[PDB]
Each structure stands twice: as C-alpha cells, then as structure tokens.
Amino acid sequence: EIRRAPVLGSSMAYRETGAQDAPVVLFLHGNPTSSHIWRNILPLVSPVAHCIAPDLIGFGQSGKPDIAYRFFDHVRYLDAFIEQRGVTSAYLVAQDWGTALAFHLAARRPDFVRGLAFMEFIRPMPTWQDFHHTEVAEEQDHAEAARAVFRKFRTPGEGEAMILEANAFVERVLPGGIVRKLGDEEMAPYRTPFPTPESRRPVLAFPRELPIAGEPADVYEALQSAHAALAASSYPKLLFTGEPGALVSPEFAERFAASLTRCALIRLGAGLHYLQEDHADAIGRSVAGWIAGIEAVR
Amino acid sequence: EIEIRRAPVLGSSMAYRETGAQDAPVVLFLHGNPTSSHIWRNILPLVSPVAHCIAPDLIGFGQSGKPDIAYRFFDHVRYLDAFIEQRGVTSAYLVAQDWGTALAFHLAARRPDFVRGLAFMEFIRPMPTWQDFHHTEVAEEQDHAEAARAVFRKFRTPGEGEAMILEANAFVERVLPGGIVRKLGDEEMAPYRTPFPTPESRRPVLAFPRELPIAGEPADVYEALQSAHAALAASSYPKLLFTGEPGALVSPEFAERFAASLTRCALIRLGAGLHYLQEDHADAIGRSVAGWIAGIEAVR
Ligand SMILES: OC[C@H]1O[C@@](CO)(O[C@H]2O[C@H](CO)[C@@H](O)[C@H](O)[C@H]2O)[C@@H](O)[C@@H]1O
Ligand SMILES: OC[C@H]1O[C@@](CO)(O[C@H]2O[C@H](CO)[C@@H](O)[C@H](O)[C@H]2O)[C@@H](O)[C@@H]1O
Ligand SMILES: OC[C@H]1O[C@@](CO)(O[C@H]2O[C@H](CO)[C@@H](O)[C@H](O)[C@H]2O)[C@@H](O)[C@@H]1O
Ligand SMILES: [Cl-]
Ligand SMILES: [Cl-]
Numbered sequence: 001e002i003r004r005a006p007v008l009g010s011s012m013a014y015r016e017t018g019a020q021d022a023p024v025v026l027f028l029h030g031n032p033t034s035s036h037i038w039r040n041i042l043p044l045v046s047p048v049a050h051c052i053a054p055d056l057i058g059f060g061q062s063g064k065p066d067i068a069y070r071f072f073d074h075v076r077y078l079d080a081f082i083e084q085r086g087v088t089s090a091y092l093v094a095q096d097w098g099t100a101l102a103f104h105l106a107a108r109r110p111d112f113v114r115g116l117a118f119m120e121f122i123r124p125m126p127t128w129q130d131f132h133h134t135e136v137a138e139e140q141d142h143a144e145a146a147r148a149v150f151r152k153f154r155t156p157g158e159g160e161a162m163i164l165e166a167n168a169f170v171e172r173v174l175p176g177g178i179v180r181k182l183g184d185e186e187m188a189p190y191r192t193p194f195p196t197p198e199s200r201r202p203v204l205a206f207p208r209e210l211p212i213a214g215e216p217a218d219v220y221e222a223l224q225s226a227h228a229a230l231a232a233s234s235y236p237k238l239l240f241t242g243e244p245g246a247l248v249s250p251e252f253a254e255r256f257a258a259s260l261t262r263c264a265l266i267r268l269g270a271g272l273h274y275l276q277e278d279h280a281d282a283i284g285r286s287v288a289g290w291i292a293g294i295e296a297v298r
Numbered sequence: 299e300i301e302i303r304r305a306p307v308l309g310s311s312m313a314y315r316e317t318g319a320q321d322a323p324v325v326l327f328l329h330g331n332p333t334s335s336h337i338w339r340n341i342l343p344l345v346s347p348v349a350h351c352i353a354p355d356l357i358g359f360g361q362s363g364k365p366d367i368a369y370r371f372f373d374h375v376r377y378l379d380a381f382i383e384q385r386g387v388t389s390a391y392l393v394a395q396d397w398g399t400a401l402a403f404h405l406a407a408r409r410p411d412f413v414r415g416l417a418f419m420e421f422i423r424p425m426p427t428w429q430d431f432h433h434t435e436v437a438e439e440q441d442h443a444e445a446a447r448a449v450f451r452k453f454r455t456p457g458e459g460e461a462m463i464l465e466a467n468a469f470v471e472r473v474l475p476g477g478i479v480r481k482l483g484d485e486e487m488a489p490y491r492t493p494f495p496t497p498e499s500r501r502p503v504l505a506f507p508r509e510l511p512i513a514g515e516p517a518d519v520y521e522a523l524q525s526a527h528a529a530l531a532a533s534s535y536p537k538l539l540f541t542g543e544p545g546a547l548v549s550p551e552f553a554e555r556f557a558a559s560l561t562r563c564a565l566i567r568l569g570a571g572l573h574y575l576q577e578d579h580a581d582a583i584g585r586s587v588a589g590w591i592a593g594i595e596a597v598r
Contacts, residue, residue, distance in 0.1 A: 047564075047567060048564055115593075115596075236592075236593060236596030237596070238592060238593075264348055264589075264595075264596065265347065266347065266585075266588065266592075267347060281581065281582065281585075282581065282585050285566075285582050285585035285586045285589065286585045286586070286588065286589040288564075288566065288586065288589065289538070289564075289566070289585065289586040289587065289588065289589030289591075289592075290589035290590060290592055290593035291593065292536075292538065292566075292589075292590055292593065293415075293536060293589065293590040293591065293592070293593025293594040294593040294594070294597055296415075296536035296537075296562040296593075296594065297562075297594050297597045297598070298597050
C-alpha cells in the first residue's frame with residue numbers, strides 16, 4: 001500500500017506493509033531511486049515487522065518543492081516524516097544516500113535505533129581514490145570510469161547537461177549498477193518521477209553532496225561525525241556486500257565490519273551498487289531473520 | 299570452505315561436514331530419513347560466514363559407519379550425544395528437519411542449557427491417530443494425505459515394509475523425490491543413493507517409519523516425544539519455524555498456530571514446498587538462519 005503524508009507543507013509518499021502492531025523498520029533509498037527499489041524486499045520482512053518505506057522529498061511520488069535538495073534538506077524532511085508517522089523507534093535498512101541519512105539519524109538520536117542494516121554506503125572520502133575504492137587489480141578500470149563520471153557530475157555546466165538534460169543518472173548510472181537487466185515494467189517506475197530537467201534537480205544535487213576531498217565541507221564534517229558515532233554505537237548492525245560492489249568492495253566491507261562492534265557481514269555474490277535489484281530475496285530473508293533474532297532476545 | 303571429516307563414536311564412526319570460523323557459535327545441522335548431511339550442502343555456505351557449522355550423518359546414514367544395531371530412535375539419540383561429546387561442543391544452535399527435529403527436541407528437553415536456538419521445519423510430533431499424520435484441513439489435499447497414510451501404514455506392517463523399503467528402495471526412490479517440488483539433477487540425486495547399495499544397508503531407513511509416534515506406538519518414543527513437545531512448548535530459547543505450502547507433516551495453518559503458541563518463535567513462510575524443504579528453499583533457509591544467529595549474537 002502506497003500512501004501520502006503531509007510533511008513540512010509538502011508531502012512524502014511511502015509504502016507500508018506488515019501488521020502495524022510489530023517493531024517498525026524504515027527502509028531508506030538513495031539516488032536516483034525511490035521506495036520502488038524495496039518492492040521485492042518488503043514482502044519478506046512484513047511477516048516480522050511494520051515496514052515503512054518513504055520516498056525522499058523530490059523522489060518517487062513525493063512532493064517536488066522548490067528547494068535546494070541538499071543532504072541537510074533531506075534530513076529535515078525525513079525527520080518530519082518520522083514525526084508525522086509517530087514512529088518512536090525503528091530498525092533502519094538503507095542503501096546509498098539512505099545510509100548517510102541513517103548514520104546521521106542514529107548519531108543524533110541513538111535511542112531511536114533498534115538496529116541498522118546497510119549496504120553500498122557513503123563515508124567521507126579523503127581523496128578521489130577512496131570513491132569506488134578497491135585493492136583488486138581487475139577492478140581498477142571500472143573504478144576509474146566511475147570517478148571520471150562523478151567528477152563531471154560535480155563540474156558546473158557539465159553535471160547539468162548530463163543529469164538534468166541527458167538524464168544520465170536514471171538512464172546510465174542506475175542500470176550500470178544492476179547486474180541483471182530490469183524488465184520494462186521494473187524500469188518504468190524509476191523513470192516516471194523524472195519527466196523534465198527541472199524535476200531532476202535532486203538527482204544532480206546528490207552527487208554534489210558526496211563528501212570527497214573535503215567538499216562540501218559541511219556534509220564532510222557531518223558524515224565524519226556520524227561515522228564516529230557509528231563506530232562507538234552498541235546497536236546491532238548488518239552489512240551486506242556484493243562482488244565486486246561499487247562504493248564498498250568485499251575486502252573493504254570486511255575491514256569496516258571489523259571496525260565496528262556487533263556488525264555482521266553478509267556476502268551476496270555477484271553485485272554492483274543497486275544490490276536490492278539483484279538480491280532482493282537474500283536481503284529480505286536476511287533482514288527478517290535478523291529482526292526476529294534481535295526481538296527474541298532484546 | 300567445507301571439509302568432510304570422521305569422528306569415532308561408540309566403537310563405530312560418524313561422518314560430518316564442517317565449515318566456518320572455530321571462534322563462532324556452533325550450529326548443528328540434523329537431517330532425517332532417508333537423507334544425510336548432503337541435504338544441507340547448499341545451506342552450509344550461507345551460514346558459515348556467521349557460525350561454526352557442523353552437519354553430521356546419522357549413524358547408518360550418509361558416510362557414517364554401519365554398526366549392527368536396531369537403528370531405533372534411542373539408538374540415534376545415543377550416537378548423536380556421543381558425537382557431540384567427541385567434538386567437544388558445549389552449546390549450539392540446532393537446525394533440523396524430519397527425524398532431525400525429534401532428535402533436536404529430545405536433546406533440548408534433556409539439556410536446555412545447551413540450546414542457543416532452534417530452527418526447524420517439517421517436524422515430528424506425537425500423532426494420536428493416523429489422521430494427525432500428514433494432517434490437512436484442505437479438501438483438495440485430502441486424497442494425497444490419505445495416500446501418504448496408506449504408504450506409511452504399509453511401511454510399518456511386518457513383511458510389507460521390508461519389501462517396499464529394503465527390496466524396492468521405495469523411501470529413497472519414491473518418498474524422497476515425492477517430497478521435493480523441483481526435479482533434482484542426477485548429480486544431486488546420486489549421493490542420496492550411494493549410502494544404500496543393498497537391501498540390508500537400508501535397515502535404518504525401514505527402522506525410522508516404524509519409530510514414528512502414531513497412536514501410541516512405539517510407546518517409548520511416543521512418551522519421549524510427548525515429553526519433548528511439552529518442553530518445547532515451555533522453552534524460552536529463540537526459535538525459527540519454516541513452513542512450505544502445502545508442506546507435508548506441517549500444514550501452513552498448523553504452523554501458524556503452533557508458532558504463536560510458543561515463546562520466542564518466528565514463522566518464516568517459504569512458498570511452494572512439500573516435506574524436503576531444503577532442496578526447494580536452500581537459499582531462503584540459509585539466509586534466514588544466518589541473519590537470525592547474527593541478530594541474537596549481537597544482543598547476547
Ligand atoms: O557470532 C555471530 C555473528 O554475530 C556478530 C554480530 O551480529 O558478532 C557477535 O558474535 C561474535 C561471535 O561470538 C562476537 O565475536 C561479537 O562480538 C558479537 O558482536 C557477527 O560479527 C557474527 O558473525
Ligand atoms: O558476520 C561476520 C563478520 O563479523 C566479524 C566482525 O564484524 O567477525 C565475527 O565473525 C567472524 C566469522 O565467524 C568471527 O571469526 C569473528 O571472531 C567475529 O568477530 C567480521 O570479521 C566478519 O566479516
Ligand atoms: O518481532 C519480530 C519477531 O520476533 C519474535 C521472536 O523471534 O517475537 C519477538 O518480538 C515480538 C515483538 O517485539 C515480541 O512480542 C515477542 O515476545 C518476541 O519474542 C517473533 O515472534 C516476531 O515475529
Ligand atoms: Cl549521488
Ligand atoms: Cl520415517
């Protein structure tokens with residue numbers, strides 16, 4: 001069921017399933033997706049949880065206010081959505097920019113977080129080498145092409161042409177990070193939120209928010225702080241990795257998980273950035289088991 | 299990844315598959331009739347990242363020894379207990395199907411301090427009448443359920459079961475594929491046959507249906523499993539029950555009421571499946587179990 005909540009004088013669409021008398025799980029998408037990306041995962045988790053999957057402001061079926069769509073704008077709208085829905089605590093399941101939102105939420109409200117399941121996550125990246133980082137000789141080529149594209153996204157004029165005019169994030173980056181080829185009916189709901197250049201403003205804003213080489217400084221610092229909190233947190237964590245992944249290499253995932261407390265690491269196999277589309281059943285089954293286990297003993 | 303090893307047990311030996319970090323919690327995987335640790339082969343790789351996985355072949359099954367014993371349920375209890383002691387396992391998760399669940403329930407009733415959690419499916423319970431065997435509320439399942447009762451009544455009949463199971467190898471050749479929705483590949487089916495090259499080698503396979511707790515017979519097993527089920531109902535350790543549609547020993551409707559009656563039991567619905575759920579749902583079961591263990595161990 002796909003519903004709409006009034007949020008800050010605009011609205012956010014969201015998908016909801018499960019008995020609403022169970023622990024809440026918030027599913028947080030990133031760029032350039034929507035709650036659509038969780039569509040095959042939700043039915044596997046709904047038997048054990050009240051699943052809520054919002055569309056970020058300016059994404060999916062959410063409102064399109066005339067705002068900057070910076071990371072901190074998303075923070076405000078997501079906070080307001082959570083308040084409006086009356087959610088007092090939740091598990092968080094996140095990918096891409098959803099992870100930055102999840103990390104920042106957890107840092108500000110540690111009492112809120114029952115657990116964090118995450119994948120293909122954002123972290124401060126001191127150099128461009130740390131974006132699509134990997135130590136695997138065969139992957140060096142793919143990594144450099146990603147770097148080259150996102151450098152252009154973050155270049156004035158060039159990013160506008162690519163994303164606003166040519167729709168490169170939806171038409172190229174999205175399919176580029178899915179191993180399988182989506183059916184027409186699966187791809188179409190990724191296109192429908194973004195019919196015009198103006199509508200694509202949020203999709204351009206996001207790569208310009210990535211914390212790379214100190215910029216943008218405010219996001220970089222916020223995410224450094226959020227990551228410090230995560231490393232100091234004691235709630236359960238579940239990290240998924242694909243092979244070779246994109247933002248998170250399998251070897252990095254192992255090191256990162258070991259750098260936290262109470263972080264399990266689940267290996268999904270062949271995958272790139274949008275792991276949900278290649279591994280929905282594995283993700284859903286894993287998350288559901290994990291919530292069941294936590295709730296049994298917490 | 300996965301090594302196959304052998305342990306000396308009570309003068310004989312049990313084979314077992316082992317994979318995972320030796321500093322992780324132990325998970326014991328327990329097969330039933332007429333299978334072996336082979337049935338866990340596609341589940342083990344999904345749990346080994348979070349746990350030290352140990353999957354024994356029951357005495358007289360798979361690559362385990364074939365001592366001259368009756369292969370009654372209590373014989374299996376003794377050999378499994380002895381295996382656990384020999385490997386020096388002091389606590390474990392249990393993952394079980396079929397007679398594996400009877401063994402797990404009986405172990406948990408005697409040594410609840412040993413059980414970190416129980417994940418189970420298509421399990422054995424005391425069945426006061428034949429109608430409780432392959433019980434279905436569903437009109438369109440009734441004939442198939444009746445056929446199953448007729449087959450197992452024959453297995454339990456002196457002379458008849460011998461002809462069917464020892465001579466015709468019906469448990470391996472018919473009952474097993476009968477309880478799998480997909481068709482197994484030749485290479486997947488062959489390791490189910492190799493433990494049982496002769497009629498006499500099939501004695502443990504004939505022994506099991508004759509141990510099923512149905513209408514009070516055999517009395518010792520019926521009593522033991524009544525007691526084990528009482529303990530399960532009162533138990534406080536985490537549980538995970540998987541169900542297929544329609545299943546075989548456990549109907550979806552029965553599963554839902556059963557899980558809801560227990561303490562700390564989650565129910566995981568797998569979709570189309572019969573008795574040998576691992577073969578149709580290895581990935582779903584493995585991912586579920588791994589997530590569940592990871593969650594529990596994160597909270598202590
Ligand atoms: O052990 C299973 C699984 O649990 C995790 C957290 O989900 O780690 C917990 O258990 C480990 C083994 O006992 C401990 O070493 C660890 O401190 C604890 O958090 C995963 O890391 C592990 O794979
Ligand atoms: O879930 C596996 C994941 O957990 C980590 C800690 O983040 O290690 C745990 O699990 C290992 C595998 O069983 C144990 O050997 C280890 O002692 C335990 O802390 C990661 O190393 C691993 O990727
Ligand atoms: O809650 C999800 C899942 O957890 C289980 C046990 O695995 O139940 C636990 O959580 C419930 C909600 O917090 C509690 O009411 C219950 O007592 C606790 O065991 C499953 O039953 C449930 O589906
Ligand atoms: Cl981005
Ligand atoms: Cl049997």
